[PDB]
Each structure stands twice: as C-alpha cells, then as structure tokens.
RNA sequence: UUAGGCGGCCACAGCGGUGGGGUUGCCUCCCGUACCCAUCCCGAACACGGAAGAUAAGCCCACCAGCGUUCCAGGGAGUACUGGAGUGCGCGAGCCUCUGGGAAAUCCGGUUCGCCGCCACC
RNA sequence: AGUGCAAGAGCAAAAGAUGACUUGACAGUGUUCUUCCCAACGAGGAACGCUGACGCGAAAGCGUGGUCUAGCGAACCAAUU
RNA sequence: CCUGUCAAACUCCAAACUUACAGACGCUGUUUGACGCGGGGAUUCCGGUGCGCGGGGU
C-alpha cells in the first residue's frame, strides 16, 4: 500500500530564461544531456518583436540523469516553505524545478484511455516536503 | 457539468477510448474494420461491421485463445500479434467477410508495429485490406528474430516461466503452418 | 415637449445602447430615498403607488413626480424620519423626434421613459403607522405628476 | 431582406444550441438510404459539407438515388419539383 | 351525432371556413346536415363555430325534420315512412333516424341528400352576432335548445 | 464483462464524494531498452520486450444528491400569450365575452450518480 | 483563444497551434440548387459527380483554393493558347 | 449575501400558430376527364378600404 504511494522524481527541469544562446554549452555539461531552446509569443516592447526565436532554453531530466544531478544541485539552495507548489513541486534559484508524484502518472500521461489523477492520490507539499527531507538536507 | 450551456463531450471521447474523427473516414469507405487493439500482455483483433444499435463483430481473435493451437509462448509480442490477426482473418473469411479496413485506434502507425503486423497476418489469412508493405516490418521481425537475438545477450533468461532458454521463432513458424492447413477447428 | 408624443407603447422597445447613440442623461436623482440603510421588513406600513394604465413615463415626470413626493416626506417627517420610499421603474426605453418633410424620417435621440404597465407598483414607501397619512399624501402629489390615474394602495397596515 | 445570399437570415436555422455544440455523430453521417424512401431535410449545423439551400430546411423529400456519396432527394418546392443533392449527415427517416 | 345549421352567410367570411362549410355539404344559409361526432368532424365544427348552430337533437325532432324537409338524391320525391320503406335499410324514418344518432348509417349511404334544406325560423332565432351562452344562437346548443331551432325550421 | 474490445443514444451519462475488488485468469499501474519505432531535450510520451511487485491510481462493483442535467406530481395557472367570432365595454391607448389552444419564472415533493447493442470471457 | 476582412454562423485527439512535405488555386466534362422562394430570365456563385493527371497519408481518406454567406461583367474587336 | 430594473439587432426557456410528407374522414374526378401536359388569345404591372400583425412619423 505504502510503495504505490512512495513518490518519485517526474522530471527535473533545469531552464535559463535570457532574452535572445551563449549559455547551451552550461546546461549541457551540468546535466548530462542535450538542451533545447524557448521561444515566445506576443509582440513585447522590451525589442520582443520576434514571436518565433531563441529566448531560452531547458533540459528535462528523467530517471538517473534527474537524481545524480540533484546530489549536487539540492546543497546549492536553502529550500523554503512556500517554495513549494500545491501539487507538491518545488522551484529554486539559472531555474531548477522539481516535479514529484505518486507510482501512478502514467495514468494521465498516456495517450490510450487517459484521465487525470485524483485529488487524494495527488501528492501534497507536506508528503512532498517529507520525501525530500527524507534524503540528504533539511526543510524550512 | 457548469451549467445548462455546458457541453459534455460524447462517452467515448470523456473516456478517450474513440476518435470520432478519424471513425468517420474510416467508416466512409463502407467496408467492415479490422479493428486492431492491443494490451499489456495481450493483442485483440476483431472484424467489425456497422450496426443499427451499435457495431456488429462478424469474427474476432484473441492473444489468449491462441494458445488453445499449441501457444507456449507469451502473448504479448510481434509473433503473437501476427498470429492473432491471421486467426481473426481466416475467422473471418469464415464469416463471409472478404474485404476490411485497418482500424488501428488510438494506438500509432509506426513503422513495424504490432497493428501492422495485425494486419498483415490477416491479409494473409486471404482479406482484402488496403495496406503498405514498407509500413510492416520484416519477415523475421514479425517471426520473432528480435526477441530469439535479444536472449543471445543472455547472462539471465528472458524468459522467468521456462517456455525455453534460447526461445523459438520456429515455434512462431509451427503455429503459422497449422493455422493455414486446411483442417483446423476455428 | 407635450407627453402626449411619448405616453403610449407605440413604437417596439428601443433600448439596445449597443446600437444607440447620444443619449442625454436620466433626470432622476435618487432612486433609494429616506433612510436606505434600515430594511423594509423594519416598518409597519407598507404603501405603494399603483398605475392604472400602461403608460410610458419620461425621466423628466419621473423625477418631477418623485420630487414632489419625497419633498413632502422630508417636510413633514423632516430630512431623516422614519421612512423610505422607493422607485422601482427605471426609463430604458430611448426616445425619439423627427426635429427634411418626411423624407428620411428616422427622429434623433432626445431622451428615456420607464414603461409601466397597468397594476403596477411605481412608488412603495415603507413608514410607521402614525406616518401613514403624510405618505398618502405625497403620493396624492406624485400622481399628478405623472400621466395615468393612480391608486394608493396600502400593502401592509391593518392600522385604521 | 437587407441582402440577398444564401444564409440571408439563416441565424435561427443554422445555429446549434449549445448543448449540440461541437463535431456530430458519424453514424447519421453514414446512413443508407433506399431509392423511394421518405427523408426529412434538416442541416445540422455542425456539418459543414454536403448541404442544401437553407430554404429547404423542412421539407420531406423522396430518395431518387445518389451522385457520389451525396442523395439526390426530390421535394416539390410550392409547386415546382426540385432534385437536391444532400448528404445523408442532413438527413433523417420519416416516421 | 350533431346538427349543423348555418346561420351565416357567406359574404366576408373566411375562404378556409367556408370551403369546410362545403365539404360538410352546406352551401346555403339555413341549410342542416347530420354530423358524426369524430375526431375529424370535431375540428370541422369547431372552425364553423362562429357561423354556425350546432348540437344533438332529440330522435323525434329530427323525425320531424327528416319527414318534412329530407330529399332523395334527387328529386322532389316525399321522405316519408313508405319512402324510407321502399329504399332505405330501415322501416320507417324512426328507424332511420335511429341509425343515424348512433352513426350506423349516412344520409347518402341511403340514396338521401346530406342536406336539410330547413325553412327560416318561424318567431325568429336569438341573433347571429352573439353565442348561445350569451344569448345569441350560434355555437354549440343544448339537446333542447337545439330541437327549438329545428323544430321552429320546420 | 471477478475488472475485456468495438459501439449506439451523446450530462438521465456532468461536477463532487463514500465504500469494496484481483497467485499461475483480465485490465492496469508496474519492470525494462537488444531490437521496429521514438523525443526540435528527455524509453516522459510514442514504440518495442517483459513480469519482481501492487490493488494505491485508473478501470470494474456497490452507494450518496450538495451542484449541473432528464423526467414526473402538486402549486404558480387555465394565469401570460394566442387562432376563430361579436351592432360587447372604453374619449382613447386599450379591454371584455364566447370558441379552440396554452406557457415561463418560481415553490414544493419525487426522479436522475446513465440506458441499450454486438463480440469475447469462470 | 484562434481561424485575413462586416455581421451572423461553424470548429478542440480541430476547421485552431506547431512542424514537415506539397502545389487540387490542376485539365476535361457534367448533375443539381442558387442567381430569379412560389414562377419564366443571362453573367456570376455553390454543392455534388464522372474522366485524366497528381499531392499527402499506413490506410480509410482528404485536396474541384482560403470554415460558411460579399470580392463582380454581354455582343462586337484585339492580344494570347 | 441582500435589494431595484431592462432588451428590434439577448436567450437557460417558450407558445398560440405557420409549414414539409403521409394515413384517415370529408369533398372531388374517371359520359361534367379531374391532376397534368402542349398550343392560341389576352387583359394587367397608378389601386383602395376594413380587420389582425406590423415598421416610420407628434
Ligand atoms: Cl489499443
Ligand atoms: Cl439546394
Ligand atoms: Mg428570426
Ligand atoms: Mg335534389
Ligand atoms: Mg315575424
Ligand atoms: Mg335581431
Ligand atoms: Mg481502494
Ligand atoms: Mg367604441
Ligand atoms: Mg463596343
Ligand atoms: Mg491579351
Ligand atoms: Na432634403
Ligand atoms: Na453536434
Ligand atoms: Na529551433
Ligand atoms: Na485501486
Ligand atoms: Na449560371
Ligand atoms: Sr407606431
Ligand atoms: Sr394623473
Ligand atoms: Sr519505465
Ligand atoms: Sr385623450
Ligand atoms: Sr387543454
Ligand atoms: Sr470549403
Ligand atoms: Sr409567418
């Protein structure tokens, strides 16, 4: 009952939102794996007028690539309280988000008969915080 | 579900298990569906035809029945699937039904697929279905050459349940002769 | 301009401001009078002006007649007695004057009515039972402001 | 009429209400009628192709085969027969 | 069974009403035929209404009126007993008269014209510009009221 | 249908909630990337391969009406409106009688937490 | 929300967004409705076929321009294939 | 929450009623041939009034 409901890193997506590139060879050599650019939409007056172009960029982290990279991520932030989301995912500083859920998510995922995950199954701040907590650093 | 204004979509598509837009192309041709549906561990393969209270399934085929023509193996894999689509088209052929229309789902027209290979097998069990033979995948894929070679990097048996170490695409071959011989109790 | 040109429902309703333009402002000052912070379940009495015909009646005799009537109330029970009487019409209906014989005749806009249909409540004071006599009577002035005769009907006071 | 096309004053009659909003049900899309049947013109407005002048909505015509896919249904528009071609996602059995 | 008589004429009155005056087989003021009271010849009364005087008569008024204002389908030919003997299914106009109240049978259906061409009514009737509940004497009429106008149409 | 597939009608089926159900069976979540295939970055998804584990999800089963919806009884109402007729009333805008139809809001009590078709299957 | 532009209407595993490929905005010839309700009348328009040649898709299928209703022109003469 | 009002270019609702087709009754047609088809000849394309429903206009 327990280990169908033990959350797990979804994904860990590390992202740098410039404003027109140069920092691709950064994230690459952090993470591990290839980047990925950002681009935008509605005319901005801050010389935004380019709807489609390279703004920013971001890596998605799954599995092994997520984890040994929040060993050496997590100790470079002082995790808070409202740093977390309702759904119990948390976001700090160069932006690294963490996306946490239950055994469960492919549920939502799929493409074949797919529905979203029920409120009670939905993982808390509190159940998030706790799991973190629970592996090498502290809350607050 | 908000209000009197609301609109709820129909069942099948609250439930994500129908496209209707893709269902209606498909029934405009006016032949039956070879409807092919997979599962974890299993493969589905029904002929369908259109119904006044709903669809009719003239001859239908599953992975789990195949084994009743001497199936040791898993059913979950590209042999299986092209058997169950050959099961279900000489059903069919049974039935009357001579022409079909691959009705693929939810599920993708990768190249190789399983649903290709659903279809494959009931073409050749002598159906009549609009296909592309550069879609399906390769002879010895669908015998199941992939999994035969998969086990060769052994070190552990891909197999918990002793069917056999090595595995048996032969097996695929022997299973295939006997659902196109003649006699056969469909 | 004569009321006789605006009293009766002859022409369709013509409220849409989506499609109107230029028109003037309502003359009505208040539609909430006396003291609007007490409910209306806090009194008595309960006396409402009831119009005997349908009619169109512009903001111009609304307010000359609401006037009339809340002027007496404020002069007789002073400038926050016991009362308060309300408006419940409100001029949506947009009107017009072809102010060039007959030839593009569509009029301009010159100014709103509140279309009141027969039976129907345009005042409703609420006051005490010792009050009862001076409402009646501002209602005796604001029904002579207005084009339809009127009864005074008394809603709640079994008081006499 | 203000103007004179085809959807001139058409807003009731091709308009779902809200609760028929959004891509119909291909089963009446696919129907088969017989040559001789009764069929009742309605266009629904859903569906974008195979309609017939928005005059017509109403009338029951009489199947008299098809051009394509599309019928080819008979009515008698006041006193002037007419054939259109329809599709059967605008058409329902009488009766 | 009802008794139609119209007691309007047809100047200015609507086409549509008319012809179902026609198709009821009228087509002269005080002229009367029998209707039977159907679903169908419930609507044809109700459009007539208001120029018309309707109502069940009693089996003797309408023996009365049948002897002396029914034809044949054609010819002056007296609908009396030995008449409706000689032609009818019936022996006598009580027979026929029977029949006919409990909808057996039609005027037609034995060779007689579905019109009584009544006579004016003797002492006048109550008005053609008022309903019976009124005062007046159209519409619909009560099993008495109705053999008063018959009767007085001898 | 002791959990399946394809549907019809397309909320009576929505929204929200409660309880129950799975040793070689089913559906799943699940485990996993040599292959077919896959990601403008990620075996996440898609695709392929597979069972160590699980019934917490989903799904199936049973049930709750608070919201939304369907229908029904009574009330509002034969009121509002209205097809036919009138030497009926009103200065008039307008109303009334007779005849044939007949709401809406809203109140209240019920109903509804889908129904049906085909195929497969302890 | 978006869908070029009035207004009204259509559309959500799309008719919208993105991406990639592509040129069916193709040739020929019709049926039908519209233009012109009923009820005759041209140009124009649309829906729906067929023949030919193609594009895309695994395939059913979709493409006779733009989601629908505006964006149009006789004879004579000239140029052009 | 409470409280006060509206809509030709609003609609969660919603008539009476008009209308397509069919059956039934009615009426009508098969010597008065209807329904329909083809042909000859027109006149006509200043209308008006009542009632109902209207739109403009004091
Ligand atoms: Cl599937
Ligand atoms: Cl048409
Ligand atoms: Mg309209
Ligand atoms: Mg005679
Ligand atoms: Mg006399
Ligand atoms: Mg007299
Ligand atoms: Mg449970
Ligand atoms: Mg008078
Ligand atoms: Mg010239
Ligand atoms: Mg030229
Ligand atoms: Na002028
Ligand atoms: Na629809
Ligand atoms: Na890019
Ligand atoms: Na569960
Ligand atoms: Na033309
Ligand atoms: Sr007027
Ligand atoms: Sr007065
Ligand atoms: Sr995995
Ligand atoms: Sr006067
Ligand atoms: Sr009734
Ligand atoms: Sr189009
Ligand atoms: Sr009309």
Redesign the pocket.
């Known amino acids: 009952?327990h280990?169908?409901?033990e959350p797990?890193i979804?994904?860990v997506?590390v992202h740098m939102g410039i404003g027109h590139a140069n920092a691709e060879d950064i994230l690459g050599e952090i993470t591990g794996?290839?980047?990925?650019?950002?681009?935008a939409k509605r005319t901005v007056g801050e010389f935004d007028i380019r709807?489609?172009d390279?703004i920013g960029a971001?890596?998605?982290?799954?599995?092994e690539?997520a984890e040994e990279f929040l060993q050496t991520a997590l100790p470079l932030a002082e995790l808070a309280t409202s740093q977390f989301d309702d759904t119990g995912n948390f976001s700090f500083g160069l932006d690294v988000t963490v996306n946490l859920v239950?055994?469960?998510?492919?549920?939502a995922?799929?493409?074949?008969?797919?529905?979203?995950?029920?409120?009670?199954?939905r993982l808390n701040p509190a159940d998030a915080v706790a799991f973190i907590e629970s592996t090498y650093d502290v809350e607050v | 579900?908000?209000?009197?204004?609301?609109?709820?979509?129909?069942?099948?598509?609250?439930?994500?298990?129908?496209?209707?837009?893709?269902?209606?192309?498909?029934?405009?041709?006016?032949?039956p569906?070879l409807?092919a549906?997979?599962?974890?561990?299993?493969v589905?393969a029904?002929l369908?035809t259109?119904?006044?209270?709903?669809?009719?399934?003239?001859?239908?085929a599953?992975?789990?029945?195949l084994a009743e023509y001497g199936w040791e193996?898993?059913?979950?894999?590209?042999?299986?699937?092209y058997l169950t689509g050959l099961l279900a088209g000489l059903r069919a052929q049974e039935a009357g039904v001579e022409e079909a229309?691959?009705?693929?789902?939810?599920?993708?027209?990768?190249?190789?697929?399983?649903?290709?290979?659903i279809?494959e097998g009931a073409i050749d069990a002598g159906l009549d279905?609009?296909?592309?033979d550069?879609?399906l995948?390769?002879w010895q894929?669908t015998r199941?050459?992939?999994?035969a070679?998969?086990d060769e990097?052994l070190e552990e048996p891909?197999?918990?349940?002793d069917?056999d170490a090595a595995?048996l695409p032969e097996h695929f071959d022997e299973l295939r002769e006997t659902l196109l011989d003649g006699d056969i109790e469909l | 301009?004569?009321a006789?040109?605006?009293?009766?429902?002859?022409?369709?309703?013509?409220?849409?401001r989506?499609?109107?333009t230029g028109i003037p402002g309502s003359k009505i000052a208040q539609?909430?009078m006396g003291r609007k912070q007490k409910?209306?379940d806090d009194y008595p009495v309960q006396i409402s002006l009831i119009v005997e015909?349908?009619?169109q009646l512009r903001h111009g005799s609304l307010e000359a007649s609401r006037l009339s009537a809340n002027r007496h109330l404020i002069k007789e029970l002073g400038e926050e007695g016991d009362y308060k009487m309300?408006?419940?019409?409100?001029p949506?209906?947009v009107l017009?004057?072809?102010?060039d014989g007959?030839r593009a005749?569509?009029?301009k806009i010159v100014g709103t009515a509140?279309?009141?249909?027969?039976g129907?409540?345009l005042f409703?004071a609420y006051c005490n039972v010792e009050d009862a006599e001076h409402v009646k009577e501002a209602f005796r002035r604001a029904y002579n402001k207005i084009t339809?005769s009127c009864r005074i009907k008394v809603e709640r006071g079994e008081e006499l | 009429p203000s103007?004179?096309?085809?959807?001139?004053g058409?807003?009731?009659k091709?308009?779902?209400?809200?609760?028929?909003?959004?891509?119909?049900?291909?089963?009446?899309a696919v129907e088969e009628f017989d040559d001789g049947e009764?069929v009742?013109?309605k266009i629904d407005?859903?569906?974008?192709?195979?309609?017939?002048?928005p005059?017509?909505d109403?009338?029951?015509?009489?199947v008299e085969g098809?051009?394509?896919?599309?019928y080819?249904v008979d009515?008698?528009?006041?006193?002037?027969?007419?054939?259109?071609?329809?599709?059967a996602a605008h058409l329902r059995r009488?009766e | 069974m009802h008794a139609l008589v119209q007691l309007?004429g047809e100047v200015?009155?609507?086409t549509d009403?008319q012809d179902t005056l026609?198709?009821?087989?009228i087509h002269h003021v005080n002229h009367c035929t029998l209707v039977?009271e159907?679903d169908?010849?419930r609507?044809?009364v109700?459009?007539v209404?208001?120029?018309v005087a309707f109502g069940e008569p009693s089996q003797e008024t309408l023996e009365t009126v049948l002897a002396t204002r029914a034809e044949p389908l054609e010819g002056d030919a007296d609908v009396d007993d030995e008449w409706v003997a000689e032609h009818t299914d019936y022996d006598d106009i009580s027979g026929l008269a029977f029949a006919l109240l409990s909808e057996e049978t039609?005027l037609?259906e034995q060779g007689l014209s579905?019109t009584l061409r009544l006579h004016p009514p003797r002492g006048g009737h109550d008005?053609?510009?008022?309903?019976?509940?009124?005062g007046?004497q159209?519409?619909?009429h009560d099993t008495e009221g109705i053999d008063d106008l018959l009767e007085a149409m001898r």
Do not use: C, W
Not at chain 2, 73 to 81: F, L, V, W
Not at chain 4, 66 to 70: I, L, T, V
């Open positions: 009952f280990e169908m409901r797990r979804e994904k997506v794996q290839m980047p990925v650019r950002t681009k709807e489609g390279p971001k890596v998605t982290l799954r599995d690539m239950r055994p469960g998510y492919r549920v995922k799929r493409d074949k008969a797919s529905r979203s995950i029920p409120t009670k199954h | 579900a908000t209000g009197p204004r609301y609109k709820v979509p129909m069942r099948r598509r609250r439930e994500a298990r129908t496209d209707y837009h893709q269902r209606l192309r498909l029934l405009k041709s006016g032949k569906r409807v549906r997979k599962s974890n561990k299993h589905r029904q369908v259109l119904g006044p209270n709903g669809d009719d399934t003239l001859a239908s599953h992975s789990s029945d193996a898993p059913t979950g894999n590209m042999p299986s699937a229309v691959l009705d693929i789902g939810l599920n993708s027209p990768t190249p190789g697929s399983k649903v290709f290979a279809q279905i609009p296909h592309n550069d879609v995948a390769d894929r199941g050459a992939h999994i070679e998969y990097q891909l197999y918990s349940g069917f595995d | 301009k004569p006789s040109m605006y009293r009766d429902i002859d022409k369709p309703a013509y409220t849409r989506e499609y109107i539609h909430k409910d209306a015909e349908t009619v309300t408006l419940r019409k409100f949506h209906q017009r004057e072809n102010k007959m005749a569509f009029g509140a279309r009141v249909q027969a129907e409540q409703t339809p | 103007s004179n096309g085809p959807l001139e058409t807003r009731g091709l308009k779902n209400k809200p609760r028929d909003r959004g891509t119909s049900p291909p089963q009446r009764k009742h013109l407005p859903s569906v974008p192709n195979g309609r017939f002048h005059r017509f109403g009338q029951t015509g009489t098809k051009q394509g896919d599309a080819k009515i008698v528009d006041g006193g002037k027969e007419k054939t259109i071609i329809v599709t009488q | 309007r200015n009155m609507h009403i026609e198709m009821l087989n039977p159907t169908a010849y609507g044809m109700a459009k209404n208001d120029f039609t037609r579905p008005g053609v510009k008022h309903p019976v509940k009124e007046g159209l519409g619909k």
